[model samples]
Target: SSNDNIELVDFQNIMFYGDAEVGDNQQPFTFILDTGSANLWVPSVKCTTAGCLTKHLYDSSKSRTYEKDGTKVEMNYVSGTVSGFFSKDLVTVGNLSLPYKFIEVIDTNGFEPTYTASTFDGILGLGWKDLSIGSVDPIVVELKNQNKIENALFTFYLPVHDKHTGFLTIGGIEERFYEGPLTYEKLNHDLYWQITLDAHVGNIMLEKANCIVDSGTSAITVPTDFLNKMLQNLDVIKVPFLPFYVTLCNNSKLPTFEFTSENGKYTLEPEYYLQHIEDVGPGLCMLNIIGLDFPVPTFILGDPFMRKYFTVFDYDNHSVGIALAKKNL
Candidate 1:
């Protein structure tokens, strides 16, 4: 039997979220299934931050199985930081259930304004155990240890069409969600789902680059020089101080961007790169890729990249798999 099936809510293609059951009563909460970080966190009732005011707050008193571990937890990201304490509960996703220890955030601050405006209630980290705070074991790791799943694998099918939802299948693969053959790549790092990338725009091959398959991030991020070169080649002009590149929406001639890995090549069409921004007016569009100012040498492959590829994270084998996504009717 399939271990779990989580449905994702597509928030204008910017972010996707799925529901998780916490505590003995299985109180449902929405979580962003993030691959960029490890450790799970949900807002506690004591959290009164701007973001937590509207989210579903977790109450330890409401669950009979709740136990306070008293271990302090703090997670810092490029966007924000969250501080909390450890709490044990019966956590369930799809058909899999287990007693899990997760952070109950009592203080949520330093978050971007967008974080407060989003519809998700929390974040569920799916990265490696080493990335977990306080050496806490991630849910997937616990599942593997319990031998609850037939195979330590999970697949993401992100819809690119009008479908308002996508799915995350854990423990096994569903052949119907993808097309052609699945290509497997060795993991470059265990922290994040990192993989080697051979990316190009037109005839310009990008410099030594690696990419993290991050579902939590919204846009693709690349080095400044690489992005500048890409826009320059496409005759796209920068929008002054803003992190955006603009071009005439009517322009039909655009270069195809291709990303190659040990597995195979994934190509992006014009629609995937040219995003229409209504605020910028009717005839102008912006590039889907952004320039990262940080000194990090890796790119974050987000929703833009996942939309075209059905990705799989194989925990037992320590590998990543990808294939062309099946078309949605």
Candidate 2:
């Protein structure tokens, strides 16, 4: 099939999710296409937790194509872990419908309050097959194995700011979403779409930084040491208790975040750095940067960075393409 452009719903400017059909009956469920992880898992009907009951749950007994695997597995995350079992069923994503092996999570206690309030049902991880859990093949790899798509390529057009709706284009890239010729960069590894990028805050810059363009994260994540150094160079306030940094809604003197590749230099001003939480309270603006436990000089360019450009992931060529997104707003 051609480019399967799956429409997405941006929830609280955090997770942009889309729906997918599971089983032979075409059961509908919302999912987050995370490039950082590799596994397709959803809430099981056997789940008794509040997090599982809140969203759509998958029932194996409802479909004839549902094959039982029952291999116990637990997926780890930054927040918590979710335990589930392996199951096989006819799954359809975009234009590909194949006999898919996925995990049916019966435990969501690791999710806590975060999972209960979410608008998505599960996660459709798009990472490398090497990162896949158990014996499950990746969605992109299967799309080619079963001969459903022409190329092992995908693209994301994530519109932030005013328009929160965008798309996840499978199989190929669309010319309509981006402007100018794409600037390509070779991947550092095949595990997480990781690349080498240069990041700057002002006169201070980190050259040849190991960065990952991860849509699973909401903020531009960095180590605590780098965050401390970044705080000193900025005119922002660090609020205690929660992991938050705030500044006035309109601060023109705010330092900009700069990211560079081979032929691309993407710059972000205060308007792109600080965001109004929940689209409520116009005065309370929070920084879109976060501190993580990862090693220093390693940055995770999350939503704030991807929203500024149209991202293309080429698995066959081991390269990533970036172009200025033509926002609908």
Candidate 3:
């Protein structure tokens, strides 16, 4: 009975997997288990954009119990912005079904070739209620409000390679996938899962930084200045155009990466973060970290970090817990 959790359907999205049914007919839609932003949206049937044309669109008319809100809304992203109108319906995920108001997107402006070609149909935000656009509570919060789950929390176990499938457990933690006690990191704000983190390269601790645990991001992103400094401090060379850095594949002395928080001391060795490239050079490998020039010194702890740690988002406690993960499932 305790093991009754939602199984992620497809690995099409790099972050994680989930396909939710929007209406009574079970119109299937693959959505991102996003933590960066909060707003549930799917491409509308009216959307004629290139991105919408290639994917499944939500049509309210086909549903029996669909309700209309008609509130025009817009969400801004670093890569793009989306515009849509609000509608209410029965949203189903795995074994659970609930009623909520969600957006049906009509515009995908600024979402370029990447968004157009993506396999996912929409996004399901897992952040706090404040992180969401307006008065709408996140789905997790909604489930809690409806007394479907005992707690207002969720756990993420992002899949690694093809070992075992991943899952997102709403309301509580699933301990079988992880070992030992979870080290909790208190939040800096109620907006996103913001935390004050410190980065360490070998013996050096590169300035304390503001970071968020975002499932939407695929790599461990750092400030451009910190990334360049890390490059100078290590033996890696920046690959032009691409955000990735490379070092000698056979080089045995690659520097180590360690991230720090209140009760956190996460150390990632070379093998965990480096991807070997066979056809490019004699022996070259790519580093899994990337650099972004954010207006503020913000870092994004994404897939690379989550893959190694079983992350728990505790809304009731206002904390995040990380522990060593078991690779099997």
Candidate 4:
């Protein structure tokens, strides 16, 4: 059984075919496997806001369900908001080959445009602890209780828009997932996977003293002091700093930064860092080093990173795993 170490499963943007019933009514929709957050929420037909109009909403009028404590819940993010009373609904995924699971229906006005465009009615959170859904349970937990997977382990290897082909895996790891040894560090707390990272780009080494392995974050941020050091190392010239704000002028090519894992290492190419040029302003073409120096803080391991490695998040065991993706998984 030692050879069984762990099997990898690569899941793409595939549909978990099925419908949901709330208040004695049936509502069909597609769900995405997301582990970046906790709590599984779907937009129901009951929603009338512009945000809900774009997708199929779950109607509660026909379902035999009741509101819990009649407490109105409002969830806010950098992008959108979901506000509504908490109610239970019967939901099914994967052709009901997976059992009907009880889900929380938050009668919301809308979702951020970023999510609304995806055609998904709602979200299926596969993160640790039910922070948002407290008393309620996770959809994955229900699947596990019914003997769906050997473990409540979820993995993701998202597709890269360009030459990359990736997927998100649920349950376990496959032998062909990665060629190099997967390095892992202990999670700092119950809520996040934190690590000490030394980002290197040739001789331009910018050490981000502490970095949180956040799946929710959108991008990588390096401190300004280190950015200057890195730019200088790349044989690039620098301009004087502007008052009230920091600005640098350089025609040289942007430098790269390397993210090292235990068994293997990866790099955050200059293109990835330079794309955020807009944040720097018209006069500023160089990268914006956040000048941040905080550890035990959150730094996002956003889509860019996910598209590279197949990440495994284990809530029950309070751990996380990763492997260099060999192919589309």
Model 4 Cα displacement at 213 (Å)? 4.1
Model 4 regions more than 4 Å off: 1-26, 61-70, 93-118, 133-137, 161-166, 193-218, 221-252, 261-264, 271-296, 327-329
Candidates in order have lDDT scores of 0.80, 0.81, 0.78, 0.51
Q: Write the per-residue lDDT of candidate 2 for residues 1-329, one digit (tens) a residue.
A: 26677887777765588788889998889988888888889999988887887789998999899999898999887866889899999888875688888889998999877788788888888888777888566787778766777788889888553575788888887888898889888888887878888878777688887888887777888767767887785667787876888776775557777878768887777776678754545576888788875654688878777787789988888888888888662
Q: Which 10 consecutive residues of model 2 have the lowest summed lDDT?
A: 275-284
Clash number for each model: 0, 0, 0, 20
Error of 4 at 258 (Å): 2.8
Model 3, 126-178: lDDT tens digits are 78778788667878777878888888888888776467777787777777879
Q: In model 3, which runs have C-alpha deviations exceeding 4 angstroms?
A: 9-14
Better of 2 and 3 by lDDT: 2
Q: What's the TM-score of each model vs. the native?
A: 0.93, 0.94, 0.92, 0.66
Which ten contiguous residues of candidate 1 have the minimum total lDDT?
A: 156-165
List of clashing residue pairs for candidate 3: none
Quote the lDDT for 42 in model 1: 90
Look at candidate 4 and tell me the lDDT of residue 243: 13
Clashes of 1: 0
Candidate 1 wrongly placed segments (more than 4 Å): 293-296
